[PDB]
Design a protein around this ligand. Structure first.
Ligand SMILES: [Zn+2]
Ligand SMILES: [Zn+2]
Ligand SMILES: [Zn+2]
Ligand SMILES: [Zn+2]
Length: 356
């Protein structure tokens, strides 16, 4: 073998080193899905991980939120270059008069922070927060990774179609993507599949609920459903609107170094080195404001790219990467929040091999 041995040789040492109780890994190669399952979903019960185990994917959720937002645009709810307050009456007169929906989606509204301030934890206080927010930078000039930013994008995009976000996600988007084992709120029927996360203190934990949580980091899913979503991104057919929506998430709106920001997905010119992938996923990019390289117009980024997204929650660590031109992808879902650097290194190791 190369493939079982390739994945095993990379994943198993990493689990030992970061004491990861469980991981589900899925890869795509030559049209087919391959599942590699390690350890336990639940330490107390000993339930083993499978490709049907539900994990919190954290901010990988943004790629689905982005797809939802794109879908609403395609269906005419809004245009990406519309000012945000065109689609939020309660933001008329605020800074959002001068921010576009695209800018919201791509963390470039002007310095919205990584998280809401702590007592911005209700709908009323969230509205006042945005109404009263004072931009740090001119719109479209700085990227600062931000849950309030893509949070509001997803919320307003769903509203442009007349529905709450969770309804649009659960009743329209996920069903059209053929993702029937993916959830914002895990139903009682599926709870037996729901892994526990583990904190640094080895205490079992699950996601803290909150304002715009569903939009920013709210999805629970297993490796098989998530790879199916990645497959849709490699070459989807059928629903013309959904096809167009997926295309839109592969549009790049600006770059920061070698990373081009899309809707949800971040991408790189392919081939890409480990060092470059690491840098683009590092705190240098994710934890502080960066000035962007502006694009004259948004551009379709195409097939010879590596697309990816990191996600974590208090107890979970997720990574997804895919390369459409080479027909390869990896999904790595774990129930410990272990370093992104290890995620990226292992994924690059495996993808480098799949491309053989
Ligand atoms: Zn296989
Ligand atoms: Zn409070
Ligand atoms: Zn609202
Ligand atoms: Zn369904």
């Amino acid at each position: 073998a190369p493939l079982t041995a390739t994945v095993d040789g990379i994943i198993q040492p990493m689990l030992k080193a970061y004491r990861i109780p469980g991981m589900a890994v899925a890869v795509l190669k030559d049209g087919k899905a391959h599942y590699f399952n390690y350890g336990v979903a639940n330490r107390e019960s000993g339930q083993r991980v499978s490709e049907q185990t539900l994990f919190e994917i954290g901010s990988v959720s943004k790629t689905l939120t982005a797809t939802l937002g794109a879908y609403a645009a395609v269906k005419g709810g809004f245009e990406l270059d519309d000012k945000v307050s065109q689609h939020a009456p309660w933001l008329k007169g605020s800074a959002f008069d001068g921010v576009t929906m695209a800018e919201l989606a791509t963390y470039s509204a002007g310095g919205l922070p990584l998280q809401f301030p702590d007592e911005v934890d209700s709908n009323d206080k969230m509205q006042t927060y945005y109404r009263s927010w004072s931009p740090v930078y001119p719109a479209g000039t700085h990227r600062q990774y931000s849950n309030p930013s893509i949070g509001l994008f997803g919320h307003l995009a769903a509203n442009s179609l007349g529905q709450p976000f969770e309804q649009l996600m659960s009743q329209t988007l996920l069903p059209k993507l053929g993702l029937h084992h993916t959830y914002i709120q895990v139903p009682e029927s599926a709870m037996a599949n729901y892994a526990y996360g583990y904190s640094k203190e080895d205490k079992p934990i699950r996601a803290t609920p909150g304002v715009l949580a569903a939009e920013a980091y709210g999805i629970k899913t297993g490796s098989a459903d998530l790879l199916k979503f990645v497959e849709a991104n490699m070459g989807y057919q059928g629903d013309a609107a959904l096809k167009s929506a997926i295309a839109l998430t592969h549009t790049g709106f600006h770059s920061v170094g070698e990373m081009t920001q899309g809707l949800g997905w971040e991408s790189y010119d392919y081939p890409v080195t480990e060092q470059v992938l690491l840098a683009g996923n590092s705190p240098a990019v994710s934890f502080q404001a960066n000035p962007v390289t502006r694009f004259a117009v948004p551009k379709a980024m195409g097939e010879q790219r590596l697309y990816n997204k990191t996600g974590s929650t208090g107890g979970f660590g997720a990574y997804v990467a895919f390369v459409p031109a080479r027909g390869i992808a990896i999904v790595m879902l774990a129930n410990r929040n272990y370093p992104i650097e290890a995620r990226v290194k292992a994924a690059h190791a495996i993808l480098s091999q799949l491309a053989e």
